[PDB]
Design a binder for these strands. Structure first.
Ligand SMILES: [Mg+2]
Ligand SMILES: [Mg+2]
Ligand SMILES: [Mg+2]
Ligand SMILES: [Mg+2]
Ligand SMILES: [Mg+2]
Ligand SMILES: [Mg+2]
Ligand SMILES: [Mg+2]
Ligand SMILES: [Mg+2]
Ligand SMILES: [Mg+2]
Ligand SMILES: [Mg+2]
Ligand SMILES: [Mg+2]
Ligand SMILES: [Mg+2]
Ligand SMILES: [Mg+2]
Ligand SMILES: [Mg+2]
Ligand SMILES: [Mg+2]
Ligand SMILES: [Mg+2]
Ligand SMILES: [Mg+2]
Ligand SMILES: [Mg+2]
Ligand SMILES: [Mg+2]
Ligand SMILES: [Mg+2]
Ligand SMILES: [Mg+2]
Ligand SMILES: [Mg+2]
Ligand SMILES: [Mg+2]
Ligand SMILES: [Mg+2]
Ligand SMILES: [Mg+2]
Ligand SMILES: [Mg+2]
Ligand SMILES: [Mg+2]
Ligand SMILES: [Mg+2]
Ligand SMILES: [Mg+2]
Ligand SMILES: [Mg+2]
Ligand SMILES: [Mg+2]
Ligand SMILES: [Mg+2]
Ligand SMILES: [Mg+2]
Ligand SMILES: [Mg+2]
Ligand SMILES: [Mg+2]
Ligand SMILES: [Mg+2]
Ligand SMILES: [Mg+2]
Ligand SMILES: [Mg+2]
Ligand SMILES: [Mg+2]
Ligand SMILES: [Mg+2]
Ligand SMILES: [Mg+2]
Ligand SMILES: [Mg+2]
Ligand SMILES: [Mg+2]
Ligand SMILES: [Mg+2]
Ligand SMILES: [Mg+2]
Ligand SMILES: [Mg+2]
Ligand SMILES: [Mg+2]
Ligand SMILES: [Mg+2]
Ligand SMILES: [Mg+2]
Ligand SMILES: [Mg+2]
Ligand SMILES: [Mg+2]
Ligand SMILES: [Mg+2]
Ligand SMILES: [Mg+2]
Ligand SMILES: [Mg+2]
Ligand SMILES: [Mg+2]
Ligand SMILES: [Mg+2]
Ligand SMILES: [Mg+2]
Ligand SMILES: [Mg+2]
Ligand SMILES: [Mg+2]
Ligand SMILES: [Mg+2]
Ligand SMILES: [Mg+2]
Ligand SMILES: [Mg+2]
Ligand SMILES: [Mg+2]
Ligand SMILES: [Mg+2]
Ligand SMILES: [Mg+2]
Ligand SMILES: [Mg+2]
Ligand SMILES: [Mg+2]
Ligand SMILES: [Mg+2]
Ligand SMILES: [Mg+2]
Ligand SMILES: [Mg+2]
Ligand SMILES: [Mg+2]
Ligand SMILES: [Mg+2]
Lengths: 134, 258, 158
RNA sequence: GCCGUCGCUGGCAGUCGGCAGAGCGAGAAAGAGAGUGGCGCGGACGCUACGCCGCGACGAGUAGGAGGGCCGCUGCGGUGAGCCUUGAAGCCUAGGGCGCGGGCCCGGGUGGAGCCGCCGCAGGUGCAGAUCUUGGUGGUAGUAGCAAAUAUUCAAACGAGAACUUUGAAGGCCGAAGUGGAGAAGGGUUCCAUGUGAACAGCAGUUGAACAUGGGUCAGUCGGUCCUGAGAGAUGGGCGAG
RNA sequence: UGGAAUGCGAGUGCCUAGUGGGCCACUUUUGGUAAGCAGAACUGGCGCUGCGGGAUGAACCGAACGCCGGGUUAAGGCGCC
RNA sequence: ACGGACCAAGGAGUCUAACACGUGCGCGAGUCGGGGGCUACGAAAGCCGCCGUGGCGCAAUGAAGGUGAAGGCCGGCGGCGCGCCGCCGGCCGAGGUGGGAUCCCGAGGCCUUCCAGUCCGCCGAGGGCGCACCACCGGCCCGUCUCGCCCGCCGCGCCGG
RNA sequence: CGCGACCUCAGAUCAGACGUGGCGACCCGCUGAAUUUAAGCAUAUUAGUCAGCGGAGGAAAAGAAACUAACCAGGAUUCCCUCAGUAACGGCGAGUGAACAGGGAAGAGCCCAGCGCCGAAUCCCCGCCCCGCGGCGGGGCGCGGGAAAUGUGGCGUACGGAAGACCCACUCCCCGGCGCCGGGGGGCCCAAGUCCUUCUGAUCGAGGCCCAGCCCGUGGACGGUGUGAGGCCGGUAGCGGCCCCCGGCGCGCCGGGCCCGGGUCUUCCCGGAGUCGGGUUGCUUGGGAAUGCAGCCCAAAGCGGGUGGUAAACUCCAUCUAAGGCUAAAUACCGGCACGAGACCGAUAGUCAACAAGUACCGUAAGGGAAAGUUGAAAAGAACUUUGAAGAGAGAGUUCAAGAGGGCGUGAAACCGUUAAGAGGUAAACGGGUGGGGUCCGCGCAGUCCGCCCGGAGGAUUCAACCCGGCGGCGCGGUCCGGCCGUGCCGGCGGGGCGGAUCUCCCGCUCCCGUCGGCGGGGGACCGCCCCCCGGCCGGCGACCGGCCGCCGCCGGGCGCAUU
RNA sequence: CGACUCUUAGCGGUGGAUCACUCGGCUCGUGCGUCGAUGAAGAACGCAGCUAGCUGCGAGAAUUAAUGUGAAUUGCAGGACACAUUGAUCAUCGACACUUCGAACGCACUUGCGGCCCCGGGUUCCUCCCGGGGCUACGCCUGUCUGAGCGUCGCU
């Protein structure tokens, strides 16, 4: 259960704080798990998805072992467009099919001068929680 | 309760007789749909409901203290009967003894793996497995009113000193905890029926007499309380009825059908 | 219209009573506010009694109640003068003082004098300057064994 | 014969079994009573006693009363190791049935995500009417009607398309107190150009004051601006709880 | 010998809705020429009540009602309907 | 005689306070913490008795000042003239009659070949204690009236009983 | 005439300030109805209420008695329970209706004028110095200006206070920084399955995951994610972490203040006027020969005045000390900001308003005021071919599905079209009774099984009876061993705890001289109950048993060779 | 046979009930409990590349500065952005700015008339004219300044 008297267990209030969330909060909302090859390297379970990351889809019609570059993060629709997840319209032109960040796993981060700060932050607070437990 | 202004925020007077209209008040003039359309009364669209619910309805009930105590003693005397517990639904076919008491070191527990290992060693795990097998979405408008998920009530766990046992157990579905000094009937008898499955701890199983106490030694922790008396002692009217005392004083049965 | 047999009962519901309805749905939400501010007060006054200044012993008027004894408002300046406590320094050691009280009898005047003695003897005083004791002040052996007393101070029992 | 109510304040814990002996319907208040002396291991059903069984008599009903509903609606605490994307709710159904009924259960279809049985708890809980409320739809009915102010005709053009648009030629009206040419109040883009043909212009439109695109109102001398008219209205003062 | 006959279990207590416009008939009956009129008395009906008959029918004759099979009646009937 | 073309959804004895009776439950001459205080669901639940104040019940009656709910027999003393009156010391003790569920005694009897013969049961003439309740008659408390005679003492009196 | 004061009064775009209007749920001051009730109505009631006006605050108002009482007395205000539906008012009808005491929440007091004392010992303003500087102050100078003797500051206020003397007691108290010492807001992050097979358009579904009972759990609230997710994601839990800001509580140091108290005597002093009060009038109140308030007239006193719930006179007592001011907490809040929740409604409901709603629209205005949510997981929103001028179609394609096609979930009823079947001159419809035809159902169409026995042909690793081991039932094992309990009963050179309106060495403090009596306090004795050890019986173990013994049943393992 | 009419069923239309959803209400509770001449609330009018309404903002006009965040906004364009000689987007928000009416303040409310002071063009102080900035409402307090009185005086 949750005991914090200031958090909202209500349904429609989380279903409203979700859809009317500002962009910078929708960046955290659109997080995505790390692959088990970068997990045992960084000690980090998920990361807010950025644009130039290589990812692989795991749930849906386009789930497979093909890896693609994230082409754009359409944070207003709560979706992303990846390199080769697409579709043909009636006439023939191709469109990118949107995938939810929770149904897709990251296989190669785009390390910036800031994604390194976020990674070392998560790693820090994770060793602090391991010493808090052990 | 509904608002007190609802249905009355308009201004509408009846047109009167004539006009071949049904004499209900009607909205005043205006160049809109809602113009002369029927304003108040439960019959009309919009309008006020019949006898609007108020906020001074009597919500809370008060019960006599000696009767809350009668109900607590009756909800505890019914938790030591294998039939009244196996009929509430609990899966206690392998519990070694019903008044299930455990040592005091259980209060020293701080991991939920300890509580899981205990509930398995005591063969109490088929009841949390039954809660799991009974977790499902509700039916009705209760889903959109923060009562979306429902499940079954599991065993209760009576404690005396909170050395971390509520922290240990409060993550298992169905397990609820209860201090002896504050036994709640809404928890000992969920749904209103008697016969929930309880798991005591010896330090709490040894305060029940100081709390209520036998019929000759009063309650020590309460001010003046003695266990309710019995309206009949030998409740085995089978043994009563086939006893030579009564068997001898009867006429022969007239078991022929004419 | 009245039925066969019953009371002539007058209901006092001829005013607009639905407007001035007072519901007690905040009674549990104010009992916690009072208890919270009562422990913020029992933490603001650290060793001083939690109930507050000591009250005198006081008979009641009105022969219905003139055999019970009660806790008044303060110690009359007569009883403070008999006990030898300045009326302006009594209020600084938790002694209650109201000047309005008279003292016609003596059996109560001496009871409240004995009460002031029983309080000025149980009183653990802390030195005005911490780093330097004073003359009329309990020694640090008391001050380290000085606690905050709960409930009323020297409770009055018939 | 069957259903039900009432009455008998009826009967049944006796299913008393190889630790056995199977009964209490019979006209006549009360013991199939004790002691004291002269092989084969066998025997239906029952009994949720709030249950089961047996007997008789009875059965209308407005206003009204009471009871019983395993009649129904929505939520709450419990409980069905409940049902469900291998298809829930809802709705339709010349399909099979149950119950005196309220109602209910199956089959087929449609549908696409939630729903129900039981014990209790709660209520904004069951509609044929109220010249009821809101919404939807019929017969009337392809009916009434599309009739105030004299009047239209021919050819050509554009166009898929012409009684109704445009040109021209006829015939006519208004007949300078006009169906003319300009303004005040009011309207506010109705003005002008091009295109469109969905809706509208009570037939039609190739047209419009419709729609969609764009344009357009130029001042020392024309008005406002200024002055006072009837009157409105501060300060001073007075009144006034304000 | 429970002091006539026949029949039948009685007594008592609270709480209580609806009603407080009535009408008809046999007999008696007041006002009125009388009235499907106005007004009383006794009993029975309609109202609150179907069913067979009176062709039809609030009130007349028979007879009062759970759902059914056979038989027999009442009051009325038996040329045809 | 009035409302009604059709179909869908909505639509009318509700809640609070008071009172009365009936009913279930706990405790019971008591009863209740409702206000206050102490210790996610929980604004719940538990607890307080030197928190039972207070409410209702346990006493009525009178406008009030006020008063406020069986008695009898026994001796011994004073008084009136054998009873009564008052006065001290005894014992008995909370009415009675009628009906009255129920219970109690029980004359006699309830079979097996025949008499005596005990225990267990059951029936029963008749006789009883009598629940609740009902009727009636007494008694007791307060108000009120009538007729009376006495006792009390810090204040003797427009006193008290 | 002039000059200079003072008083009274004007003028400034004079230097520097202040008010105004809005909101209004709650609060303060006034104004103030009528619907309705009385079965009419006029007093009353509705009601000091609706409307109206003025003024504020986060609370307001009230507030330290010109009080309550009649006691063995209480002691500011506000609030709750109770007093109490009471006392009282009232066409004594309808109806209305407090207070005191008591139990609680909170708890806090004070300050002037006056009377006196002090060399006005006091205050504001401008100019300059240094600092502080985003709540305009601290310190120094100015023969700088004003206010004020028609009265500023200190002491002091009804609890008495002031002054002289006698005595004793006695150095923090306050503000301002400088500087350091460990509650609130904000930002960021911290456990574990996308593990194997299998449903689907898509899984968050179904099964599995040994003996670490798949992994985490102080985290299994919730939301999202192509149904339904503790382990995919955000989150949740945590006296979990990290980083920013605010504040408090703290300690030193500086420059300032402030030069201070109590006790006994002695001498002194002490109060609020057109106010109280009385008359009279109007309203209001439960307040009744006037509860309160207000207008008008009269108009005070000071051992006085007011109150003591029946008008008046007399006399006693109780009780405060009006006519000046301030004061937090407990208390209220349908407005505002930010939050959490719900046995509430779920798009004709719930706010009028789930939506570009106080919008569109109406009215000249004051005002009135709606209707209107849903394609799909994703627009993948039908390319292209084809007829027609176009709308519209016919193909094709997207989707799990267009039987979801831009007002598109499901798509009922009334109403209508067409197809099928029947029917038809007393409008239609209806109940009872049959017959005819249809529609499907029975998955009808050779018709039930079951027990026993008799015979007829076959097949077992098979019956009875014995032996071993286990298990269970029963036992008046008359009365076997040992336990356990008793809403059992008695005892005891026994321990203990609760209670008592049963009694009685030290100590607090008290009157009378450390002697001597009353009372505030724990022992101690005693009584009852309970508990625990002791022995006795009694009786239960059928709400509560263990071993050996006996009988019985069952299972398994043997032995049985098969007329079973 | 055929038409028309009625009934039942099939499908198809009008309509949108029912069910299932819910970024909405209602009620309860908690914390705070703050407007304005330093120009409030409200109103008017403007501002987007393509913009009507809603919303945001005010000629710095769908927002400026700063800080946190750390790569988008998106309907299409276009445009930034080594992501570190440097920061897209959001949120926070303390710096600056904030049109006209409005208590609304020069007089009036048409948008009309002013007066004073200081700047820039005009001039070359020549007032003219134009542009820019600052002032000029009512009551009221303390002081300053100038005054009135056959008000009360004193001295000349
Ligand atoms: Mg409504
Ligand atoms: Mg009546
Ligand atoms: Mg009947
Ligand atoms: Mg049908
Ligand atoms: Mg479908
Ligand atoms: Mg409801
Ligand atoms: Mg209807
Ligand atoms: Mg026609
Ligand atoms: Mg015409
Ligand atoms: Mg003419
Ligand atoms: Mg013209
Ligand atoms: Mg013209
Ligand atoms: Mg037309
Ligand atoms: Mg034109
Ligand atoms: Mg010109
Ligand atoms: Mg009538
Ligand atoms: Mg008549
Ligand atoms: Mg008649
Ligand atoms: Mg009738
Ligand atoms: Mg009738
Ligand atoms: Mg009858
Ligand atoms: Mg009849
Ligand atoms: Mg006839
Ligand atoms: Mg009528
Ligand atoms: Mg009609
Ligand atoms: Mg309905
Ligand atoms: Mg009654
Ligand atoms: Mg009762
Ligand atoms: Mg009472
Ligand atoms: Mg009336
Ligand atoms: Mg009336
Ligand atoms: Mg009237
Ligand atoms: Mg009146
Ligand atoms: Mg009143
Ligand atoms: Mg008034
Ligand atoms: Mg008002
Ligand atoms: Mg106003
Ligand atoms: Mg104001
Ligand atoms: Mg304010
Ligand atoms: Mg105040
Ligand atoms: Mg005073
Ligand atoms: Mg008081
Ligand atoms: Mg009081
Ligand atoms: Mg308190
Ligand atoms: Mg002073
Ligand atoms: Mg002075
Ligand atoms: Mg699984
Ligand atoms: Mg989900
Ligand atoms: Mg989940
Ligand atoms: Mg899991
Ligand atoms: Mg997490
Ligand atoms: Mg996580
Ligand atoms: Mg946390
Ligand atoms: Mg008035
Ligand atoms: Mg009045
Ligand atoms: Mg909660
Ligand atoms: Mg709707
Ligand atoms: Mg709707
Ligand atoms: Mg709907
Ligand atoms: Mg609505
Ligand atoms: Mg609708
Ligand atoms: Mg669909
Ligand atoms: Mg869906
Ligand atoms: Mg549809
Ligand atoms: Mg059809
Ligand atoms: Mg046909
Ligand atoms: Mg729809
Ligand atoms: Mg539903
Ligand atoms: Mg624009
Ligand atoms: Mg910027
Ligand atoms: Mg920033
Ligand atoms: Mg003008």
């Amino acid at each position: 259960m949750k005991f914090n008297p200031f958090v909202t267990s209500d349904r429609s209030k989380n279903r409203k704080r979700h859809f009317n969330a500002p962009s910078h909060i929708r960046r955290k909302i659109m997080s995505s798990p790390l692959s088990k090859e970068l997990r045992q390297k960084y000690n980090v379970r998920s990361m807010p998805i950025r644009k130039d990351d290589e990812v692989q889809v795991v749930r849906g019609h386009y789930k497979g072992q093909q890896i693609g570059k994230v082409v754009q993060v359409y944070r207003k629709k709560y979706v992303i467009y990846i390199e080769r997840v697409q579709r043909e319209k009636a006439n023939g032109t191709t469109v990118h099919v949107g995938i939810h960040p929770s149904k897709v796993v990251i296989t190669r981060l785009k390390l910036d001068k800031d994604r390194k700060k976020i990674l070392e932050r998560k790693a820090k607070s994770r060793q602090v929680g391991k010493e808090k437990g052990k | 309760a509904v608002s007190e202004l609802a249905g009355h925020q308009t201004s509408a007077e009846s047109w009167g007789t004539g006009r071949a209209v049904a004499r209900i008040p009607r909205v005043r003039g205006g160049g809109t749909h809602r113009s002369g359309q029927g304003a108040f009364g439960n019959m009309c669209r919009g309008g006020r409901m019949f006898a609007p619910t108020k906020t001074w309805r009597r919500w809370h009930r008060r019960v006599n203290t000696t009767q809350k105590r009668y109900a607590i003693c009756s909800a505890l005397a019914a938790s030591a009967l294998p039939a009244l517990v196996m009929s509430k639904g609990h899966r206690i076919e392998e519990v070694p003894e019903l008044p299930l008491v455990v040592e005091d070191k259980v209060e020293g527990y701080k991991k939920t793996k300890e509580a899981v290992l205990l509930l398995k060693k005591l063969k109490a795990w088929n009841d949390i497995k039954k809660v799991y097998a009974s977790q499902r979405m509700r039916a009705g408008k209760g889903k959109m009113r923060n009562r979306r998920r429902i499940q079954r009530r599991g065993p209760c766990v009576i404690y005396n000193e909170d050395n971390g046992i509520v922290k240990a157990f409060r993550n298992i579905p169905g397990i609820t905890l209860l201090n002896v000094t504050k036994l709640n009937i809404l928890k000992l008898a969920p749904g209103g029926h008697v016969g929930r499955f309880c798991i005591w701890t010896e330090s709490a199983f040894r305060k029940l007499d100081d709390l209520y106490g036998t019929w000759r030694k009063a309650a020590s922790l309460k001010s003046n309380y003695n266990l309710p008396m019995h309206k009949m002692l030998n409740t085995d009217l089978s043994r009563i009825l086939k006893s030579p005392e009564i068997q001898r004083a009867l006429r022969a049965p007239r078991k022929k059908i004419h | 219209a009245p039925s066969r047999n019953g009371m002539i009962l007058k209901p006092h519901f001829h005013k607009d009573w639905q407007r001035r309805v007072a519901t007690w749905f905040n009674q549990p939400a104010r009992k916690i506010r009072r208890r919270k501010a009562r422990q913020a007060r029992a933490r603001r006054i650290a060793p001083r009694p939690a109930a507050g200044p000591i009250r005198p012993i006081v008979r009641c008027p009105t022969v219905r109640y003139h055999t019970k004894v009660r806790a008044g408002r303060g110690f009359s300046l007569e009883e403070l003068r008999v006990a030898g406590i300045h009326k302006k320094v009594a209020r600084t050691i938790g002694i209650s003082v109201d000047p309005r009280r008279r003292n016609k009898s003596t059996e109560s005047l001496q009871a409240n004098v004995q009460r002031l003695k029983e309080y000025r003897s149980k009183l653990v005083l802390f030195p005005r300057k911490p780093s330097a004791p004073k003359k009329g002040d309990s020694s640090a052996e008391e001050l380290k064994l000085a606690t905050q007393l709960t409930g009323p101070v020297m409770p009055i029992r018939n």
